Amino acid sequence: NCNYKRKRRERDWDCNTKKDVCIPDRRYQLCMKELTNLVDITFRKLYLKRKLIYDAAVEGDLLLKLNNYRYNKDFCKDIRWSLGDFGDIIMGTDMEGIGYSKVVENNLRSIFGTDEKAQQRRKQWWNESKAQIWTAMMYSVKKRLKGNFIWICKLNVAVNIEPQIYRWIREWGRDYVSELPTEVQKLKEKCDGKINYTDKKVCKVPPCQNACKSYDQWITRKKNQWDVLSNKFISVKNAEKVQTAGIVTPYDILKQELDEFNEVAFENEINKRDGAYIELCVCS
């Protein structure tokens, strides 16, 4: 799949492959071409690093294309989310660990080891290499324009280690606030206005009643996705023993990442009791 990237939200979060977690489409598409075809200090330090750079440079390239060559925050976050997954793969915390990823894990184990002391060497190797992998993902974005280049994306913000489930809630919440206005804008067009003099269009108008079943189907996947992701967060936070600086509930992660995040409305939105939804899709 190191060819091109499916359009944003062409495919939603996959909560079925592994039942305990939802996986975003970007994680599947993560380019691991060279990292699989690998079949002695130089075994890891020089060779494995080059292989990971060749993959990171591609990911950083197709992600720039995914974002229509826009050099904005939406692009930097795709870099941040993907660079982390590269790390969880190296550090043995890849939550998916399915299919082609199983080959990469076996490749890394035949390099570092298999015991507890191997994760440390791998976690250490990621720390002393994560910076260089970020410069690789920024390759295409930096080659493209020799001049006029700016460090829009920042390094330490991307190489800050954080449990994988955290960074996926960040990506999810960013997808939710982008999708909600759309599913509402569609609802507004077909349901605004009053039908006769005081009744709502959804009571009788099929066109409006249909846009509601589309939103009803969408918001239900969001509620369910939030349920799984927040439960998987509680399982990890309880098992890690690290304080991760001010995050207790998964709602804190959205407050940090989202601007003007009103979790009161968020709870209302995903539970179909918000204001706009009642005015448009609830008759009585």
Epitope: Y54, A57, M138, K143
Partner: single-chain antibody, 227 residues
Framework: QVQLVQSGAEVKKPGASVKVSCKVS????????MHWVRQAPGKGLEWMGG????????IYAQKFQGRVTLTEDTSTDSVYMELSNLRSDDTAVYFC??????????????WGQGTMVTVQSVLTQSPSASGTPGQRVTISCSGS????????VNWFQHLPGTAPQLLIY???QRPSGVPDRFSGSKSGTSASLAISGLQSEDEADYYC???????????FGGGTKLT
């Protein structure tokens, strides 16, 4: 706008030393790698060394490790490369070039104008090619699996008199200014450049470049000239 300006032509006596400058203009030197390559009048392009900034610890070619020393001066925003024990066959034109965004990549982007100094290869290309306006031509590059097999390939359009320019990188991708008629491909142990619709601006010698895992250095091909 990012320029590289080198020092004037120098003439030395066999056995002496020579120091060439290379100044950046339009971007902080502190981020670039600043490699160097030379080309004798009769021979082709050869890579000497460079400063791998991501790791420090500059690297050099094989039978050059005892003659080249790269220095730097952040105040003057320039790089210096010194050659000692100058032999008669070291007469050539010396270039400084960088990838500008590469960590372990060598798809050079910004080249200097060269410096005239007066005192085979792992990759194998076809000795020469020839074509007529409007046809497809295919220059091929062939090497072992330790240089082209497991690493990306680049292509260069060098017009003698001027400095080479990046034509293709990562075996498939073309820069902005490169025409759409150019295109690259790689498979197994051989890459190939393709010019769909040979026009008049093909008056150049074409080289392929890749990274050799066994040599730990940048290697160039023999060369190929179209007409």
């Amino acid at each position: 706008q990012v320029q590289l300006v080198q020092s004037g032509a120098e003439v030395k006596k066999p056995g002496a030393s020579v120091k060439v400058s290379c100044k950046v203009s339009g971007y902080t030197l502190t981020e670039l790698s600043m490699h160097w390559v030379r080309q004798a009048p009769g021979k082709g392009l050869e890579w000497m060394g460079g400063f791998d900034r991501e790791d420090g610890e500059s690297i050099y070619a094989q039978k050059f490790q005892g003659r080249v020393t790269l220095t730097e001066d952040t105040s003057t925003d320039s790089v210096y490369m010194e050659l000692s024990n100058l032999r008669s066959d070291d007469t050539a034109v010396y270039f400084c070039a960088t990838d500008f965004g590469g960590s372990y990549f060598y798809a050079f982007d910004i080249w200097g104008q060269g410096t005239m100094v007066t005192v085979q290869s792992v990759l194998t290309q076809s000795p020469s090619a020839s074509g007529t306006p409007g046809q497809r031509v295919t220059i091929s590059c062939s090497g072992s699996s330790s240089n082209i097999g497991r690493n990306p390939v680049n292509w260069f359009q060098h017009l003698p008199g001027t400095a080479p320019q990046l034509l293709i990188y990562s075996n498939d991708q073309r820069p902005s200014g490169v025409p759409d008629r150019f295109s690259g491909s790689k498979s197994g142990t051989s890459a190939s450049l393709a010019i769909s619709g040979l026009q008049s601006e093909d008056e150049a010698d074409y080289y392929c470049e890749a990274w050799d895992d066994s040599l730990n250095g940048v290697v160039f091909g023999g060369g190929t000239k179209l007409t």
